[PDB]
């Protein structure tokens, strides 16, 4: 059984590792080149709308480790130096005319990988662009010289060695010298003595040294010119502007301190890091800066340094002559912990958070001119400065970029009423964690939401005049009455509209230039602009069943299938036709095309019958109410809609099917799709100034033509019951949709289809959630290191309040009344959390449909849950139990545990409440719980045990202790047990029913730091890797299940593939109705991918040759080798990189012609064959 | 081969081997983004401080020799 796979990415990584800013486009506009994990991305923040748009996104197929920008003297465009996991340094130039990164230079100096002594981790550039220095973590440092030629093109020189044996580098930074010899300051630490002293005395009292390396340009050689030891170890440096602007020098950020230390006769200046007033953190914990941003002006310059608590300070340096006098820090604001920050002109700050969403703020004030205390290095104290954190008062949130990093669990299931499965993603970081629901489609912007009484069944939006550029009324039809609203910029309820709906309403339209028409089951009501009402009673005891309105026509269908036709005279009144036609059966839906501007009436009338047929009827007076063409349907119609782009008749049936049909005197060609599970309703909407149609079944789909090429894209939104086009000053082009018991004003701004989200905030970092089959709800465990439980936060906060009074200050001061009162928002001001053995774990029952949490269970202080499951036991009835594996007093480094516990819950009220059953203890942490044959398999340490349910505790029924290291996960087919060792890959264990004896009958030949897995069949397991790999391991068919260097029979690895991002969830599922199963994986960088099987050997050979061609014609951007990158830890086995293949569309046309002609094809054929994979296994909304 | 740090010979002690692979491991953590992410999520510490402690564990790992 040959198994060849094909990888593709659906949601590229959203977590940001680096972020630089500059004039990369070569204009006045400033862009932000950010680096995700393995993807280089060019973003542009708009100074007008304040939104961040992704200009470019390129997959580099390599590990980006350092990112810098520079500019030559007299230059107007910034280049991009990229330090990678390749043995090469690359200098790139963005091209706006071609929207691509042009690799200007690439030099090869070392081996591939994130190596110890191979440069690529650190990258510092001379602020005048004359030289660049790329350095490793240890022992190797190289310097290239940058000079432009006569054609103004950048040129690079040969490398200059600056190596120094037994040296570790904490950080490298180029020093701003005013066109002097280039200087590179860096933090070093010599470990030669620490390794040759068995006492450990040389290990201690060994501090790092700030060293200045000079590039002698006249002599063309680098020399370790300067060096001085530092008082305490520092984490990073900051380039202080020198030359004409400011004094040269570096800022050394250090544990609880910051030190300006320019060399020469400049004295070291230090200032303590200010701490927040009344820290809930452990006082033994220090405080460092996580990142820094620098803004340079011809007038002044300042810095913005963020702490571990997200505290951004505005650091300023006062200076006299060429020397610095003092370091002046001032509390700026607080944002989430950022991995990088960029201060841009026109007053904008880009904050790329280390985890979770990213943010773009507008600098309203510099942070001075307020009365907040400003600290200085010259201020004496011995004690640190204290400040008060406050809400955002110097920045305003202008844009928020949704990032899924880090994704820790993922279940792709259809929990909502829709048909396409949703991606339920447990992802986040501490207090900013969340459970986000992902639907792939068009983003819906909720303009307004208001609940409605009773059960609404319809809605319309009517203008007051034809020349009105905005609608006037929103009509909502219930069962026994209709409510009329006026969009008067306040959406007030109105009564004098004239509709006066004491009955349900079938239609509301604008007939005359200013006349309104309401159609209700008891008849027709005409409302002139002048408040005149002309009624129309239904003939006899009948009622009108259906209707079709128009700008100048009103067709109606009454019980018994009796049509009545009304036409408006140019004199403004309606005249009924002199004839009434009967049908072969009752009418269930009608549609009447809009009148063209020049013409005075529409000719065609679509009428669907209970006969399961649609019929076209002419309304021209030559053949008024005469049959034109009939058409049989596979089921009963539900709605009809005629629309132009060339006339199309749309049919939505009572089963979920939709049909488009050509139209004119006769209706001919046809297409259909399954939209089904729900009857398809059809509504006219105005999209992008054109007429689009909106289908409504299990999801709301939008069909619209695009360059004579249709599109049917679903909306990433819940099910809706009705919709109508909307236009107001608040929302110029929107859609009014009523759903079950709610009225919603929506808008379709974005046109591209992506994974859209709805986020449910959590309290702690989630580890796992399980699907309760009956309740369809979620049981989530949220565990965090270094944390306090809520009770400990209260008792500790209060304890501080008591200790506040013991100062005996005239006793008359109650600052505790302001301290105990305000609980600072934990999500924005960071989590008040500290401690090495401290933890915080919480069990939560959440409904996935809405955002509400059904139940909440707060655990003890030092208890940390790592496993959870929902199942039933054979000995008991159909009662659902929730088992939660917890650990006690976890010292993570070095590892040491006190014990573990297992909570058992009864989950009564069909998954709405948890009630405490018992808490059974155990000696080691249990990190794996799985239901198995009416009983539960629990993994405690390296021991795999079979447990049954008891009235007092979970009784141990079986045990196995021959597992190598530690159980991280366990999944079981009905008969076998697949154990995931923390280090020794997968272990196959059979459970003997007769003796309760777990027997290991197979294991792996390779060690694998497993993170997650999923059983593909009875013999194959797909597993993820801590190092970012994915494998598929298959048992040979001759494996004997009943038996009694590790095990006898081994399992062969049939697939190896390095993804490049650590995968934490594998799931074999179908993404869309009608498609095929795919191996969808999530990753720790907030990315979603799929692995896809080939159906024929011809396709495998085709895409494989595409891979071989693009490996040489389109090599990775950062000098990495593609085959080597995908063979990082294990050689590639039966995977084709589809992310590389889809770059065929990005090559130059001559390369597409060469590669395609080599495969005896054309570039469009290659592109379509690449699209077929996405059509089969992913999302393709192309509607012929 | 001798001038490549991490290379071994016949008289290489276990302490030298494991301090070698320990420093290699720490630098690999510094390199691969999602690895440092997993570690910075396990222990509730920011990426910066995790990198800092990984750099402090460079002359410290396995303690002093014999
Ligand atoms: K029927």
Curated annotation (Swiss-Prot), chain A:
It comes from the Eukaryota. One of its GO terms (biological process) is positive regulation of DNA-templated transcription. The keyword Nucleus applies. GO terms for cellular component: catalytic step 2 spliceosome; nucleolus; nucleoplasm; nucleus; SAGA complex; spliceosomal complex; U12-type spliceosomal complex; U2 snRNP. It is found in: Nucleus. The keyword Hydrolase does not apply. Component of the 17S U2 SnRNP complex of the spliceosome, a large ribonucleoprotein complex that removes introns from transcribed pre-mRNAs. The 17S U2 SnRNP complex (1) directly participates in early spliceosome assembly and (2) mediates recognition of the intron branch site during pre-mRNA splicing by promoting the selection of the pre-mRNA branch-site adenosine, the nucleophile for the first step of splicing. This is Splicing factor 3B subunit 3. It comes from Homo sapiens (Human). The gene is SF3B3.
Swiss-Prot record, chain B:
GO terms for biological process: mRNA splicing, via spliceosome; positive regulation of DNA-templated transcription; regulation of DNA repair; regulation of RNA splicing; U2-type prespliceosome assembly. The keyword Nucleus applies. Its main location: nucleus. Keywords: Acetylation, mRNA processing, mRNA splicing, Nucleus, Phosphoprotein, RNA-binding, Spliceosome. The keyword Nucleus applies. Residues 1-62 are annotated as: Interaction with SF3B1 and SF3B3. One of its GO terms (cellular component) is U2-type spliceosomal complex. The modification N6-acetyllysine is found at residue 3. Belongs to the SF3B5 family. Component of the 17S U2 SnRNP complex, a ribonucleoprotein complex that contains small nuclear RNA (snRNA) U2 and a number of specific proteins. Part of the SF3B subcomplex of the 17S U2 SnRNP complex. SF3B associates with the splicing subcomplex SF3A and a 12S RNA unit to form the U2 small nuclear ribonucleoproteins complex (U2 snRNP). Within the SF3B subcomplex, interacts directly with SF3B1 (via HEAT domain) and SF3B3. Component of the minor spliceosome, which splices U12-type introns. Component of the 17S U2 SnRNP complex of the spliceosome, a large ribonucleoprotein complex that removes introns from transcribed pre-mRNAs. The 17S U2 SnRNP complex (1) directly participates in early spliceosome assembly and (2) mediates recognition of the intron branch site during pre-mRNA splicing by promoting the selection of the pre-mRNA branch-site adenosine, the nucleophile for the first step of splicing. This is Splicing factor 3B subunit 5. The chain holds residues 15 to 80 of 86 of the full protein.
């Amino acid at each position: 059984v040959d198994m060849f796979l094909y990888n593709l990415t659906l949601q590229r990584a959203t977590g940001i590792s680096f972020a630089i800013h500059g004039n990369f486009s070569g204009t006045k506009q400033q862009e932000i080149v950010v680096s995700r994990g393995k993807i280089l991305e060019l973003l542009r923040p708009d100074p007008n709308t304040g939104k961040v748009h992704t200009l470019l996104t390129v997959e580099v197929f390599g590990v980006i480790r350092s990112l810098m920008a520079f500019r030559l003297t007299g230059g107007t465009k910034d280049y991009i130096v990229v330090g990678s996991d390749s043995g090469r340094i690359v200098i790139l130039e963005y091209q706006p005319s071609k929207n691509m990164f042009e690799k200007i230079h690439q030099e090869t100096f070392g081996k591939s990988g994130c190596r110890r002594i191979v440069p690529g981790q650190f990258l510092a550039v001379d602020p005048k662009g004359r030289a660049v220095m790329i350095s490793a973590i240890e022992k190797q440092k190289l310097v290239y010289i940058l000079n432009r030629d006569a054609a103004a093109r950048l040129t690079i020189s040969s490398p200059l060695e600056a190596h120094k044996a037994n040296t570790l580098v904490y950080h490298v930074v180029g020093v701003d010298v005013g066109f002097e010899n280039p200087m590179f300051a860096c933090l070093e630490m010599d470990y030669e003595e620490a390794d040759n002293d068995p006492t450990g005395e040389a290990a201690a009292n060994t501090q790092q040294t700030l060293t200045f390396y000079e590039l002698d340009l006249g002599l063309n050689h680098v020399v370790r010119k300067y060096s001085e030891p530092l008082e305490e170890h520092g984490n990073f440096l900051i380039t202080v502007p020198g030359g004409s602007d400011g004094p040269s020098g570096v800022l050394i950020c250090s544990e609880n301190y910051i030190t300006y230390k320019n060399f020469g006769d400049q004295p070291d200046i230090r200032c303590p890091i200010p701490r927040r007033r009344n820290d809930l953190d452990d006082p033994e914990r220090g405080m460092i800066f996580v990142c820094s941003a620098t803004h340079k002006t011809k007038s002044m310059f300042f810095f913005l340094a963020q702490t571990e608590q997200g505290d951004i300070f505005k650091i300023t340096l006062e200076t006299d002559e060429d020397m610095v006098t003092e370091i002046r820090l001032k509390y700026f604001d607080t944002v989430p912990v950022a991995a990088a920050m960029c201060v841009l002109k026109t007053g904008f700050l880009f904050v790329a958070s280390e985890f979770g969403n990213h943010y773009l703020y507008q600098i309203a004030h510099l942070g001075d001119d307020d009365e907040e205390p400003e600290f200085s290095s010259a201020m004496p104290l011995e004690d640190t400065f204290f400040f008060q954190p406050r809400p955002l008062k110097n920045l305003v949130l202008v844009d928020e970029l949704d990032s899924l990093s880090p994704i820790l669990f993922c279940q792709i299931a259809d929990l909502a009423n829709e048909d396409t499965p949703q991606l339920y993603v447990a992802c986040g970081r501490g207090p900013r964690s969340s459970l986000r629901v992902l639907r792939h489609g068009l983003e819906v912007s909720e303009m307004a939401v208001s609940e409605l009484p009773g059960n609404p069944n319809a809605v319309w939006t009517v203008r007051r005049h034809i020349e009105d550029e905005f609608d006037a009324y929103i009509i909502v039809s219930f069962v026994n009455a209709t409510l009329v609203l006026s969009i008067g910029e306040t959406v007030e309820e109105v009564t004098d509209s004239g509709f006066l709906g004491t009955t349900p309403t079938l239609s509301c339209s604008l007939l005359g230039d200013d006349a309104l028409v309401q159609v209700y089951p008891d008849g027709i009501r005409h409302i002139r602009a002048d408040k005149r009402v002309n009624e129309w009673k239904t003939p006899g005891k009948k009622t009108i069943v259906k209707c079709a309105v128009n700008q100048r026509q009103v067709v109606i269908a009454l019980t018994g299938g009796e049509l009545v036709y009304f036409e408006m005279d140019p004199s403004g009144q309606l005249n009924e036709y002199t004839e009434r036609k009967e049908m072969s059966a009752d009418v269930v839906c009608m549609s009447l095309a809009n009148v063209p501007p020049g013409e005075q009436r529409s000719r065609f009338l679509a009428v669907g019958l209970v006969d399961n047929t649609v019929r076209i009827i002419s309304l021209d007076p030559s053949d008024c109410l005469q049959p034109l063409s009939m058409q049989a349907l596979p089921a009963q119609p539900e709605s009809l809609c005629i629309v132009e782009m060339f006339l199309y008749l749309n049919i939505g049936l009572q089963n979920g099917v939709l049909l488009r049909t050509v139209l004119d005197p006769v209706t001919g060609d046809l297409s259909d799709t399954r939209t089904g599970s729900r009857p398809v309703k059809l509504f006219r909407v105005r999209m992008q100034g054109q007429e689009a149609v909106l289908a409504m079944s299990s999801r709301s789909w939008l069909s619209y033509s695009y360059q004579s090429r249709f599109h049917l894209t679903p909306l990433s939104y819940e099910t809706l019951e009705f919709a109508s086009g909307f236009a107001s000053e608040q929302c110029p082009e929107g859609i009014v949709a009523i759903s079950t018991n709610t009225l919603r004003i929506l808008a379709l701004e974005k046109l591209g289809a992506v994974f859209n989200q709805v986020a449910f905030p959590l309290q702690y970092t989630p580890r796992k959630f399980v699907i309760h089959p009956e309740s369809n709800n979620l049981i989530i465990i949220e565990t965090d290191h270094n944390a306090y439980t809520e009770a400990t936060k209260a008792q500790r906060k209060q304890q501080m309040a008591e200790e506040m009074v013991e100062a005996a200050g005239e006793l008359a001061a109650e600052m505790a009344a302001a301290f105990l009162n305000e609980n600072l928002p934990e999500s924005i001001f960071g989590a008040p959390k500290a401690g090495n053995g401290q933890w915080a774990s919480v069990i939560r029952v959440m409904n996935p449909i809405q955002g509400n949490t059904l139940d909440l269970v707060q655990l003890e202080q030092n208890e940390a849950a790592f496993s959870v499951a929902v199942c039933r036991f054979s000995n008991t009835g159909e009662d659902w139990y929730v088992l939660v594996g917890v650990a006690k007093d976890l010292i993570l480094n070095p590892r040491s545990v006190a014990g573990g516990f297992v909570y058992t819950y009864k989950l009564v009220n069909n998954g709405e409440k948890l009630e405490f059953l018992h808490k059974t203890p155990v000696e080691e942490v249990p990190a794996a719980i799985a239901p198995f044959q009416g009983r539960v398999l629990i993994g405690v340490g390296k021991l795999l045990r079979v447990y049954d349910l008891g009235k007092k505790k979970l009784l141990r029924k079986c045990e196995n202790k021959h597992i190598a290291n530690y159980i991280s996960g366990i999944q079981t087919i009905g008969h076998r047990v697949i154990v995931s060792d923390v280090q020794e890959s997968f272990i196959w264990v059979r459970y003997k029913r007769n003796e309760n004896q777990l027997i290991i009958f197979a294991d792996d030949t390779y060690p694998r730091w497993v993170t997650t897995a999923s059983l593909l069949d009875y013999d194959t397991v797909a597993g993820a890797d801590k190092f970012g790999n994915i494998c598929v391991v298959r048992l040979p068919p001759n494996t004997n299940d009943e038996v009694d260097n590790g095990a006898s029979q081994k399992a062969e690895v049939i697939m190896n593939y390095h993804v490049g991002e650590t995968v934490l969830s594998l799931q074999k599922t179908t993404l869309i109705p009608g498609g095929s199963e795919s191996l969808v994986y999530t990753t720790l960088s907030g990315g979603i991918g799929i692995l896809v099987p080939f159906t024929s050997h011809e396709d495998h050979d085709f895409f494989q040759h595409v891979e071989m061609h693009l490996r040489s014609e389109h090599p990775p951007l950062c000098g990495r080798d593609h085959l080597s990158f995908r063979s990082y830890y294990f050689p590639v086995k039966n995977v084709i990189d589809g992310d590389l293949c889809e770059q065929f569309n990005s090559m130059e046309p001559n390369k597409q012609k060469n590669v395609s002609e080599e495969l005896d094809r054309t570039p469009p054929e290659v592109s379509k064959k690449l699209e077929d994979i996405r059509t089969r296994y992913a999302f393709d909304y192309k509607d012929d | 081969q001798s001038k490549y740090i991490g290379t071994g010979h016949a008289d290489t002690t276990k302490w030298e081997w494991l301090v070698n692979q320990h420093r290699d491991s720490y630098c690999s953590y510094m390199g691969h983004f999602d690895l440092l992410n997993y570690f910075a999520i396990a222990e509730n510490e920011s990426k910066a401080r995790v990198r800092f402690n990984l750099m402090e564990k460079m002359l410290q790992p396995c303690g002093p020799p014999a």
